[PDB]
């Protein structure tokens, strides 16, 4: 499920206090930021430019220059009639998706206070049913400019498809890289009298797909509990896999890690009770 999206986070805290952040993301990986001070797009990687010319980037910088300020200002002025109460937050994500190497869809959705509010589909803004009357009112206001909705539509259905294909191609050495994990064993918090929790840590792997199991020889231990895959600053991933056992059955346990980068040589670590 490969996607690219631009996010907007606009926070409105007070009468005269507010923040606006715009960034570009290839799934979990940040590839762009909007720099309002200099009014420019910041390329975080040399390949963030994709296959777009300098001229197309300038044009896109202008579009973001004008739209960021008009949207920020617009929401602050419409807040009273829309009944947006301070403090509030608006979030937007827009972009496109790839299924099996083909652009499958484009999207554009907006949230108010952490909940779906409106979305843009089929060349117009549509209210989320449970958001109520204020969402219908918001769309009434957004759908009043066909010119501006046609620009939005061109960017979702023509600019974005072109861009993501160019971005994955240009970034191919970074995104197709394989980094081997290291692993280690420790104790976890004790489940109670006469029992232990065993923990296998798997750190520094890329890409994200991984397999980790507690084992007794060739027998997978079904009590194995996988934690969330957690990020590290260097772009790699971390995972803990735990197992609870009676103290007297900790002998002969091991942790097996399989990853794409290991070229068939699984990491195997043995729990030492001696």
């Amino acid at each position: 499920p490969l996607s690219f999206h631009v996010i907007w986070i606009a926070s409105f805290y007070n009468h005269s206090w507010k923040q606006n952040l715009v960034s570009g993301w290839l799934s979990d990986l940040q590839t762009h930021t909007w720099d309002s001070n200099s009014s420019t797009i910041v390329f975080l990687w040399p390949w963030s430019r994709g296959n777009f010319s300098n001229e197309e980037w300038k044009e896109l910088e202008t579009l973001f220059r004008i739209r960021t300020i008009r949207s920020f200002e617009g929401i602050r002025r419409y807040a009273h009639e829309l009944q947006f109460e301070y403090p509030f937050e608006i979030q937007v994500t827009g972009g496109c998706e790839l299924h099996s190497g083909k652009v499958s869809g484009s999207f554009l959705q907006l949230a108010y206070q952490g909940s779906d509010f409106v979305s843009f589909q089929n060349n117009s803004w549509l209210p989320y049913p449970v958001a109520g009357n204020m969402a219908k009112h918001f769309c009434k206001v957004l759908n009043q400019n066909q010119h501006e909705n046609d620009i939005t539509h061109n960017l979702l259905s023509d600019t974005c498809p072109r861009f993501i294909l160019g971005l994955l191609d240009a970034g191919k050495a970074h995104l197709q890289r394989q980094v081997k994990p290291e692993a280690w064993l420790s104790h976890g918090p004790s489940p109670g009298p006469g029992h232990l929790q065993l923990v296998c840590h798997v750190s520094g792997f890329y890409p994200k797909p991984v397999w980790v199991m507690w084992m007794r020889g060739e027998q997978e231990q079904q009590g194995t509990q996988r934690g969330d895959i957690l990020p590290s600053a260097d772009g790699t991933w971390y995972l803990r896999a735990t197992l609870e056992v009676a103290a007297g059955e900790a002998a002969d346990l091991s942790c097996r890690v399989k990853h794409s980068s290991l070229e068939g040589q699984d990491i195997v670590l043995y729990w030492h009770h001696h």
Binding site: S23, Q30, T33, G114, L230, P231, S232, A233, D234, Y238
Partner: protein, 99 residues
């Protein structure tokens, strides 16, 4: 809606006393975005701590990674302190190499 933050602390490498490592605090699933996050050494704020740009998940909830280099010792205690409007007091989660 408001969502309370999940907080998870971990090192990049196996702990080894006297050798340089990275301490991480991943704060996720919160709303609104306004949050205070500190890494602590012996209860006391660590000064040069980096964090990722603010982002959010598909469910609209926010997430950040905070990290710094550090050197584990027998005596030194490390932790992540989080304040958010959903919490009545700041939450502290300790780094423990054997938990």
């Amino acid at each position: 809606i408001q969502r309370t933050p999940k907080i998870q602390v971990y090192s990049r490498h196996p702990a080894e006393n006297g050798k340089s490592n990275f301490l991480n605090c991943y704060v996720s699933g919160f709303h609104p975005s306004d949050i205070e996050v500190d890494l602590l050494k012996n209860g006391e704020r660590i000064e040069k701590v980096e964090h990722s740009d603010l982002s959010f998940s598909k469910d609209w909830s926010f997430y950040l990674l905070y990290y710094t280099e550090f050197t584990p010792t027998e005596k030194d205690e490390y932790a992540c302190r989080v304040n958010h409007v959903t919490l009545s007091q700041p939450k502290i989660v300790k780094w423990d190499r054997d938990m």
